[PDB]
Amino acid sequence: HMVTGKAFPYVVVTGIAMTTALATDAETTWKLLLDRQSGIRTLDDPFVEEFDLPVRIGGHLLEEFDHQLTRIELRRMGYLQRMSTVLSRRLWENAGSPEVDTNRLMVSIGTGLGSAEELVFSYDDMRARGMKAVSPLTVQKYMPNGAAAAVGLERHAKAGVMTPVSACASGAEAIARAWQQIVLGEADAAICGGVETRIEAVPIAGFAQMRIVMSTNNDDPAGACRPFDRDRDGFVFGEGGALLLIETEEHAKARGANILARIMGASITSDGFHMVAPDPNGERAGHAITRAIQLAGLAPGDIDHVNAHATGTQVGDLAEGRAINNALGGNRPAVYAPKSALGHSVGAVGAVESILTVLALRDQVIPPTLNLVNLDPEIDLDVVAGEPRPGNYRYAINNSFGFGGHNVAIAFGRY
Amino acid sequence: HMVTGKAFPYVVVTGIAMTTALATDAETTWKLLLDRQSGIRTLDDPFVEEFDLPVRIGGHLLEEFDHQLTRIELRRMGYLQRMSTVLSRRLWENAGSPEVDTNRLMVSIGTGLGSAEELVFSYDDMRARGMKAVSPLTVQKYMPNGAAAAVGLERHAKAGVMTPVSACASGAEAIARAWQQIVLGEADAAICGGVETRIEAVPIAGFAQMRIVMSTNNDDPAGACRPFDRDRDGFVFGEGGALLLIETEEHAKARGANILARIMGASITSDGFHMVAPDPNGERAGHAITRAIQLAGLAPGDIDHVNAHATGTQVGDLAEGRAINNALGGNRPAVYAPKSALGHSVGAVGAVESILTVLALRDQVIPPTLNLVNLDPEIDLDVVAGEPRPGNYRYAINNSFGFGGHNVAIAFGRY
């Protein structure tokens, strides 16, 4: 039998690394998240004051990757690749720069969009520069597996290098695959998480038009997003990247790491409903929670926290609240959707919220959902909104349900 | 101790579907293959035959996915998306058009690149038609998960829709994930495989300059690529797509399905070596064979066939032959290089060669390598060159080790 306690070994988190709209690191970001501060500001870019779209807001990164490496490392890598490289280094440092067996070390990093803006740069180049006048390994750059492949090379990772893709669940799925391989005996340690491109126009165009990005609230950047608030209109785009260092408990102890939390379960499901909209009942989404809870050897009543994947979209937040109640039932955990304070990361958001589920366990304190006054009357959830709520948090679950019906639910036990 | 016989259930192949250069379907392609026919021709194009390609040879397909779908579906899908859609339909019919429980049905379609060409179409559009003169869900089109998402929609699949991206091994990994989920207890049936776009000038430019595409024997199309031949210049590019219907043996028997073979194992590894040419010793590549063999509850001596990945490059083929012997040792199975007659598919090639490992099992016959006259004496393997070699084939293994050092080995057993 295929459960955490029994067949599978116990796996744990040993390091953490991210870059978000609030901070250049994981630690500072956490503090800012508790002082109920948002990281969304008036989106100011070139295609902005100029180009013409109704959304002028979004959380963005507070750092450049150009002054953090050599001249040669720049040319040999693309945006995502430069990002992951830097995060891995920070992560390997937090963990305590361990010297592991690379034959048992793996990497899994996913993206939702992938090297897009990069193609216009390299494709229009051949039609000017030359075919004999360009770097040889530039192919690797626009590949949707560059960020993963890049990190897999720095550390002699010889246990596999993967790149699942899933729109908004890419970051969580990356972590799910990591936990799966380990559990399955395919590895003993893994670097996992997500990485997403900068804010381009291309998406916002084919998204403002719809309904989703219905946060046309360009006057109140910080206040524009409102997960479960009855007055919610849409979601906000945000930048970021997040990586973790997952490893069996036995492995971690043999080198005395700093265990933050533990990873005990993860399931992957699909709606097979709409290619843009999530089923309004959340039948399959609620089911992925049931599996994460079972593969972890727990019960619906052991879950104390639920780091929701609520963007602030009308039909999105309602279908999630309905999926929480389907898995849990009568139990009621403290819900917190971090997007309202940071932004919809997308490829990277799932990895970021997974790092927030850990800190909540390592600290037993959850920050507020920023903008909340009247909890939607169709939504039955105990959403944290006032002040961070410390307490006793034995277990928790992170939700990541991306566009197109990609569902991922990961169980994070306390240590 | 987890193996196909004890910890996991037995899984099987119930349907086939692929489009290649030789034939437009799996069955016809097989016939043409055993009859020693190549699918390569003179690379006729304006950006190749006019504007500066030393290599003017390749293997294109033999059909267009246009006259096959509706007016509305055309504008809703991109190339890969149209391809997978059509293949799934053929596959679902070859499977006897089964009716399955979609809550236990999953899809896993992998790619190398995704819809890149799609971005030049949509990005340059906003700068002309307008921000409101484009289609809202065009994002989904250029997403690296479009081919998977598309198929997951036609069948209302609810067991997960996944998109592994590992370049050349994307197609094999798609199948590895399929087998893993079923065996893990996350599903009972899955559509898996890989898809790849057309031969574009963007890759060949940033690749023909290295020391691999050395297959510049244009003045002799069919006679150029030679897998383990001493005089092997480079590899050739071919198009294609391949999908399979994998499912538990117990499930298959209930609905009375036609079983061709059995999938019994699959491992994923990486070299962490170079970002082009792999480890000349094939240590990690040979290791993925050891795991596919173990995960299937077999021994190095039970493998009779090996549908090698060998492309036809100098340092590739050598490192593979060395990895075969590392896994097996003294044993010697009938090795076959399919790319020699078809061509490098990339995202899709692994899925195509996996369908060839099955037919060899279902028919007990193996086609010959199309360009072997004097195998490099630096390799010790039994390769088929002249005439097909039928016989008793209990088990087999498909090799897929893509550029960048992505290794996948899947074990197939006759039914």
Catalytic residue among A60, A251, A305, A344: A344
Residue A35 CB burial class (10 angstroms; 0-12, 13-18, ≥19): exposed
| Contact (CB, 8 A) for B298 and B333 | no
Residue B39 tokens, joined: 């699918």
Residue B270 tokens, joined: 């990486």
Q: Which residue has the tokens 């530039």?
A: A138
Q: Which residue has the tokens 């390749």?
A: B58
**B186 to chain A: which residues are within 8 Å by CB?**
267-268, 291
Method: X-ray
CB atoms closer than 10 angstroms to residue A332: 14
Catalytic residue among A60, A251, A305, A309: A309
**A185 to chain B: which residues are within 8 Å by CB?**
2
**What residues contact residue B62 under an 8 Å CB cut-off, 6+ apart?**
B21, B23, B24
| Contact (CB, 8 A) for A367 and A34 | yes
Instruction: Return the bridge partners of A16, or none.
Output: A244
Task: Answer yes or no: A309 catalytic.
Answer: yes
Interface contact flag, B131 A106, Cβ < 8 Å: no
| Contact (CB, 8 A) for A354 and A412 | yes
Residue among B112, B149, B270 minimizing CB distance to A159: B270
Residue A356 tokens, joined: 């927030």
How, if at all, do strands A395-402 and A241-248 pair? unpaired
Interface contact flag, A161 B166, Cβ < 8 Å: yes
**What residues contact residue B146 under an 8 Å CB cut-off, 6+ apart?**
B77, B78, B80, B81, B114, B115, B140
Question: DSSP class of residue A302?
Answer: T
Interface contact flag, A269 B158, Cβ < 8 Å: yes
Interface contact flag, B210 A136, Cβ < 8 Å: yes
Instruction: Return the bridge partners of A108, or none.
Output: A162, A192
Give all domains of chain A, ordered by start, each with its CATH number: 1-264 (3.40.47.10), 265-415 (3.40.47.10)
Distance in Å, alpha carbon of A382 to nearest chain B alpha carbon:
28
Residue among A52, A137, A180 minimizing CB distance to B275: A137
Residue A158 tokens, joined: 């010889």
Distance in Å, alpha carbon of A2 to nearest chain B alpha carbon:
7
Interface contact flag, B272 A102, Cβ < 8 Å: yes
CA distance B233 to B134: 46
What is the identity of the amino acid at B329? G
Q: What is the dihedral of CA B30, B36, B42, B44, to 10 degrees?
A: -10
What is the identity of the amino acid at B197? T
Q: What is the separation of C-alpha B207 from the centre of its chain, rounded to a whole number of angstroms?
A: 20
* For A267, nearest residue in chain B (alpha carbons): B186
**Which phi and psi angles does B229 have, rounded to 5°?**
-75, 145
**B52 to chain A: which residues are within 8 Å by CB?**
131
| Contact (CB, 8 A) for B176 and B194 | no
| Contact (CB, 8 A) for A11 and A305 | no
| Contact (CB, 8 A) for A147 and A84 | yes
How, if at all, do strands B334-336 and B382-383 pair? parallel
CA distance A58 to B147: 30
CA distance B409 to B309: 10
**What residues contact residue B115 under an 8 Å CB cut-off, 6+ apart?**
B78, B79, B80, B81, B141, B142, B143, B144, B146, B197
CA nearest A182: which of A263, A100, A74, A69? A263
**Residues composing chain B:** 415
Angle at A390 between CA A385 and CA A395, to 5 degrees: 100
CB atoms closer than 10 angstroms to residue B377: 7
| Contact (CB, 8 A) for B359 and B213 | no
| Contact (CB, 8 A) for B375 and B232 | no
Q: What is the dihedral of CA B65, B66, B72, B76, to 10 degrees?
A: 40
Please name the helix (run of DSSP H) or strand (run of DSSP E) that holds residue A151, with its range, or none.
Answer: helix A146-154
Q: Which residue has the tokens 């090795």?
A: B335
Question: Three-state SS for A15?
Answer: strand
* Resolution reading in Å: 2.4
Distance in Å, alpha carbon of B66 to nearest chain A alpha carbon:
22
Please spell the DSSP secondary structure of A205-272, one letter per residue: HHHHTTSTT-----S-GGGS--TTBTT-----BB--EEEEEEEEHHHHHTTT----EEEEEEEEEE--
CA–CA distance from A28 to each of A94, A125, B410 (Å)? 14, 40, 45
**What residues contact residue A316 under an 8 Å CB cut-off, 6+ apart?**
A212, A235, A278, A310, A401
What is the identity of the amino acid at A228? F
Residue among B120, B132, B206 minimizing CB distance to A136: B206
Residue among B165, B173, B205 minimizing CB distance to A126: B205
CA distance B79 to B88: 14
CB atoms closer than 10 angstroms to residue A325: 17
Interface contact flag, B206 A291, Cβ < 8 Å: no
CA nearest B123: which of A51, A202, A52? A202
3-state SS, one letter per residue, for chain B? CCCCCCCCCCEEEEEEEEECCCCCCHHHHHHHHHCCCCCCEECCCCCCCCCCCCCCEEECCCCCCCCCCCHHHHHHCCHHHHHHHHHHHHHHHHCCCCCCCCCCEEEEEEECCCCCHHHHHHHHHHCCCCCCCCCHHHHHHHCCCHHHHHHHHHCCCCCCEECEECHHHHHHHHHHHHHHHHHHCCCCEEEEEEECCCCCHHHHHCCCCCCCCCCCCCCCCCCCCCCCECCCCCCCEECCEEEEEEEEHHHHHHCCCCCCEEEEEEEEEECCCCCCCCCCCCHHHHHHHHHHHHHCCCCCCCEEEEECCCCCCHHHHHHHHHHHHHHCCCCCCEEECHHHCCCECCCCHHHHHHHHHHHHHHHCCCCCCCCCCCECCCCCCEECCCCCCCCCCCEEEEEEEECCCEEEEEEEEEC
Question: Three-state SS for A164?
Answer: strand
Instruction: Return the bridge partners of B269, or none.
Output: B407
CA distance A223 to B252: 54
CA distance B105 to B182: 9
Instruction: Return the bridge partners of A164, or none.
Output: B164
| Contact (CB, 8 A) for A307 and A336 | yes
**B129 to chain A: which residues are within 8 Å by CB?**
none
Annotated catalytic residues of B are: 168, 309, 344
Interface contact flag, A272 B7, Cβ < 8 Å: no
Residue B60 tokens, joined: 């294109």
Task: Answer yes or no: A225 catalytic.
Answer: no
**Which phi and psi angles does B222 have, rounded to 5°?**
-50, -30
**Which phi and psi angles does A180 have, rounded to 5°?**
-65, -50
Interface contact flag, A207 B139, Cβ < 8 Å: yes
Question: Three-state SS for A165?
Answer: coil
CA distance A106 to A244: 12
Angle at B14 between CA B382 and CA B324, to 5 degrees: 20
CA atoms within 13 A on the CB side of A42: 7
Instruction: Return the bridge partners of B59, or none.
Output: B238
Distance in Å, alpha carbon of A168 to nearest chain B alpha carbon:
11
Residue among A122, A145, A186 minimizing CB distance to B167: A145
CA nearest B409: which of B238, B270, B245? B270
Interface contact flag, B153 A269, Cβ < 8 Å: no
CA distance B362 to B219: 37
Residue among B137, B160, B268 minimizing CB distance to A270: B160
Residue A306 tokens, joined: 């639920």
| Contact (CB, 8 A) for A404 and B149 | yes
**A155 to chain B: which residues are within 8 Å by CB?**
272
**B167 to chain A: which residues are within 8 Å by CB?**
143, 145
Q: What b/e sequence results for A261-293 when a residue is b if at least 16 CB atoms lie within 10 Å of its CB, and e otherwise? A: bbbbbbbbbbbbbebbbbbeebbbbbbbbbbbb
How, if at all, do strands B334-336 and B303-307 pair? parallel
Question: Three-state SS for A334?
Answer: strand
Q: What is the separation of C-alpha A14 from the centre of its chain, rounded to a whole number of angstroms?
A: 18
Please name the helix (run of DSSP H) or strand (run of DSSP E) that holds residue A105, with its range, or none.
Answer: strand A105-110
Interface contact flag, A207 B114, Cβ < 8 Å: no
Residue A67 CB burial class (10 angstroms; 0-12, 13-18, ≥19): exposed
CA distance B34 to B41: 19
Instruction: Return the bridge partners of B103, or none.
Output: none
Q: What is the separation of C-alpha B302 from the centre of its chain, rounded to a whole number of angstroms?
A: 24
Catalytic residue among A60, A168, A251, A305: A168
CA–CA distance from B159 to each of B152, B190, B387 (Å)? 10, 9, 43
| Contact (CB, 8 A) for B208 and B55 | yes
Q: What b/e sequence results for A359-385 when a residue is b if at least 16 CB atoms lie within 10 Å of its CB, and e otherwise? A: bbbbebbbbbbbbbeebbeebebebbb
Please name the helix (run of DSSP H) or strand (run of DSSP E) that holds residue A406, with its range, or none.
Answer: strand A406-413
Question: DSSP class of residue A21?
Answer: S
Please name the helix (run of DSSP H) or strand (run of DSSP E) that holds residue A202, with its range, or none.
Answer: helix A201-208
Distance in Å, alpha carbon of B267 to nearest chain A alpha carbon:
8
Question: Three-state SS for A108?
Answer: strand
Q: What is the dihedral of CA A153, A154, A159, A164, to 10 degrees?
A: -70
Residue among B144, B206, B269 minimizing CB distance to A158: B269
CA distance A82 to A128: 26
CA distance B52 to B46: 9
Interface contact flag, B186 A158, Cβ < 8 Å: no
**A102 to chain B: which residues are within 8 Å by CB?**
272
Q: Which residue has the tokens 């950047």?
A: A221
Residue B194 tokens, joined: 């890989």
CA distance B386 to B368: 6
Instruction: Return the bridge partners of B105, or none.
Output: B189
Angle between helices A146-154 and A79-94 (to 10 degrees): 40
* For A47, nearest residue in chain B (alpha carbons): B127
Residues before each break in chain A (C–N > 2.5 Å)? Answer: none
Q: What is the separation of C-alpha B137 from the centre of its chain, rounded to a whole number of angstroms?
A: 29
CA nearest A109: which of A68, A166, A59, A30? A166
* For B184, nearest residue in chain A (alpha carbons): A2
CA distance A53 to A47: 9
Interface contact flag, B164 A163, Cβ < 8 Å: yes
**A114 to chain B: which residues are within 8 Å by CB?**
114, 144
Interface contact flag, A180 B185, Cβ < 8 Å: no
Question: Three-state SS for A12?
Answer: strand
Residue A183 tokens, joined: 């559990």
